[PDB]
Design a protein around this ligand. Structure first.
Ligand SMILES: Nc1ncnc2c1ncn2[C@@H]1O[C@H](C[C@@H](N)CC[C@H](N)C(=O)O)[C@@H](O)[C@H]1O
Length: 199
């Protein structure tokens, strides 16, 4: 009989994908299966894990090839509850209500002028009791952006956006990019990480 567990190794070991994001794995201990939106899904590590575990996933990205790859894997695995779209997040408005919206390591790639409108759109489209998970690069006095991302959160800025939500988790811890500097050392930067629940 076919083994039903779909853990953080499943898509990782079968389709050469990076392991499911640590914050997605944590989030699901708290966030129950529901209508989900993965904004900038890439090659789908997070959308695929979610859909395989009962979440109804809208998985969106600008990269047509990345979307094709998600669709390829979706077809192989019969993930009926995973739906894809090639979208430009800089030029996008949406209107469906969701239990869970996540954007993991995507927002720093967007135009700075997109962010206020997108975050407001995210909050608008979360159900009361629903959750938003965001992880994104920052640019701070102690950890300046050395990559030149077109956007990065300032210290305290993500928290300010989500005033009035319950911040189940919020930190601006120093992390590392995978890309390296002139001496081959991983680039150190703070990331804003938040799991927040709407009242
Ligand atoms: N303007 C844009 N609209 C939609 N997606 C974008 C845009 N700019 C960058 N992206 C996507 O952001 C993704 C960033 C990747 N690091 C994948 C993040 C993915 N959420 C993950 O946790 O693996 C890429 O797949 C890009 O195609």
């Amino acid at each position: 009989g076919a083994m039903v567990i779909r853990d953080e190794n499943y898509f990782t070991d079968k389709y050469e994908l990076t392991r499911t994001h640590s914050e997605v794995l944590e989030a699901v201990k708290v966030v129950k299966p529901g209508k989900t939106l993965d904004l900038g899904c890439g090659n789908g590590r997070n959308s695929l894990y979610l859909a395989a575990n009962g979440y109804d996933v809208d998985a969106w990205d600008k990269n047509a090839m990345s979307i094709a790859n998600v669709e390829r894997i979706k077809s192989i695995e019969n993930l009926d509850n995973l739906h894809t779209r090639v979208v430009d997040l800089n030029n996008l408005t949406f209107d469906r209500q969701y239990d869970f919206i996540l954007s993991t390591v995507v927002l720093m790639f967007l135009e700075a002028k997109t962010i206020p409108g997108l975050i407001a759109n995210m909050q608008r489209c979360t159900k009361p009791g629903g959750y938003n998970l965001i992880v994104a690069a920052m640019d701070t006095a102690d950890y300046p952006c050395t990559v030149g991302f077109p956007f990065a959160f300032k210290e305290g800025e993500l928290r300010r956006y989500y005033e009035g939500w319950e911040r189940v988790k919020y930190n601006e811890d120093v992390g590392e990019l995978h890309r390296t500097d002139a001496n081959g050392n991983r680039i150190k930067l703070r990331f804003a990480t938040m799991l927040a629940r709407k009242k």
